[PDB]
């Protein structure tokens, strides 16, 4: 059931 | 629960909605600066959305992976998790998706009234700072997907199991924002807020 998350991080600005 | 697949149209509606809602959450919770945002017309209303191509592609890729799961009604929750500098969650925007028995009796009709129904979620998110405290500076976000008991769709966009540290939030305030009960799904949006941050 996870939870699953993207391996990549959210981009920094 | 019942077992009915949402189908493509509903899955695509939800993904287009979730994209707008993520952008709007990032804006109002100041996860990213107002400078990377420009208004776009969504659901017949001006919503602030990122002009940062990489942030955009990331949100897009995430939801493209969620879409086939939605089509088959295999998603229980999509959660926008806001993490402080110590990578401890400060806020969770939970989109909980269910299909209870007898759901469709006296329900709304999403496809026929898309803008009407979803605009209310937009409004609630846009004013939710009324019921939250400010977040710490330096917050980031991620997206957690809870799958039903009974996703690697894109080149170079892998998913992994979330860690306990992603999920552990002690003493959370619960703020319900909006519920939609339509023909083939129920969606509840609510926020969980860390007690002191």
UniProtKB/Swiss-Prot annotation, chain A:
Maturation and modification: Phosphorylated by CDK1. Mitotic phosphorylation is required for the attachment of spindle microtubules to the kinetochore.
Localization, UniProt: Nucleus; Chromosome; Chromosome, Centromere, Kinetochore; Cytoplasm, Cytoskeleton, Spindle
Purpose of the protein: Required for proper alignment of chromosomes at metaphase and their accurate segregation during mitosis. Involved in the maintenance of spindle microtubules attachment to the kinetochore during sister chromatid biorientation. May recruit CENPE and CENPF to the kinetochore.
Subunit record text: Interacts with MAD2L2. Interacts with POGZ, CBX1, CBX3 and CBX5.
Protein name: Chromosome alignment-maintaining phosphoprotein 1
Organism expressing this protein natively: Homo sapiens
Gene: CHAMP1
Segment of the intact protein contained: 331 to 343 of 812
UniProtKB/Swiss-Prot annotation, chain B:
GO molecular function, one term: transcription corepressor activity
Chain residue ranges for the region called Mediates interaction with REV1 and REV3L and homodimerization: 16-150
Classification via PANTHER family: MITOTIC SPINDLE ASSEMBLY CHECKPOINT PROTEIN MAD2, MITOTIC SPINDLE ASSEMBLY CHECKPOINT PROTEIN MAD2B
Effect caused by changing residue 174 to A: Significantly prevents interaction with REV1; no effect on interaction with REV3L
Outcome of mutating residue 159 to A: Alters interaction with REV3L and REV1. Loss of interaction with REV3L. No effect on interaction with REV1
Keyword Transcription: yes
Ranges for domain HORMA: 8-191
UniProt protein name: Mitotic spindle assembly checkpoint protein MAD2B
PROSITE patterns, alphabetized: HORMA
Organism: Homo sapiens (Human)
Assigned GO CC terms: chromatin; chromosome; cytoplasm; nucleoplasm; nucleus; site of double-strand break; spindle; zeta DNA polymerase complex
Tissue occurrence: Ubiquitously expressed.
Stretch list, region Mediates interaction with ipaB: 145-197
